[PDB]
Amino acid sequence: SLLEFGKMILEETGKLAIPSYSSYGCYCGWGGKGTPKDATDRCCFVHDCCYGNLPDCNPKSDRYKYKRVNGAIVCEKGTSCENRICECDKAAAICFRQNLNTYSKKYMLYPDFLCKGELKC
Ligand SMILES: CN1c2ccccc2[C@]23C[C@H]4[C@H]([C@@H]5CC(O)N4[C@@H](C5)[C@H]12)[C@H]3O
Ligand SMILES: COc1ccc(C(=O)O)cc1
């Protein structure tokens, strides 16, 4: 659920999901079209796609459990949907951390009309 995800992001990067990653570029947030503006936005695109492989799961509200094993995120056993949601979120958090160096405030509150082009998962 968004609760586990925003907490995962905060622990990883130091930034809060909202508003550092809720209205970023073309894919971080409500976003769902265009060409990712940068690496961080590409993390959200892939995260999007990852949730995309789980049509019968509800990523926003289904809660999962996870623990830190010396920094490393370890998804704990839950239902099938919860395990996969967690893997999707774990990947995005790490991707976010790996690209913190290029995070640009230029792509914050990014206009919808500048999300141009197309990309398939
Ligand atoms: C295509 N679409 C879907 C088609 C059928 C069921 C569920 C989904 C989505 C909505 C949502 C989310 C991610 C992130 C995203 O932008 N959306 C994608 C993948 C999915 C995922 O949940
Ligand atoms: C990062 O926080 C959120 C909250 C709600 C939604 C949504 O409702 O689609 C997406 C991200």
Side-chain angles (χ1 to χ4, degrees), residues 2 17-18 22 60:
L2 266 315
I18 300 173
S22 55
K60 270 98 186 247

Side-chain angles (χ1 to χ4, degrees), residues 24-28 31-49 107 110 114-121:
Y24 193 95
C26 292
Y27 288 91
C28 306
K33 66 154 189 166
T35 309
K37 299 311 303 182
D38 71 342
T40 296
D41 201 19
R42 282 194 282 278
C43 293
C44 298
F45 169 77
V46 179
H47 186 246
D48 270 19
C49 290
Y107 294 122
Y110 203 74
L114 292 165
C115 289
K116 228 128 191 165
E118 262 317 311
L119 187 50
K120 308 161 211 177
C121 289

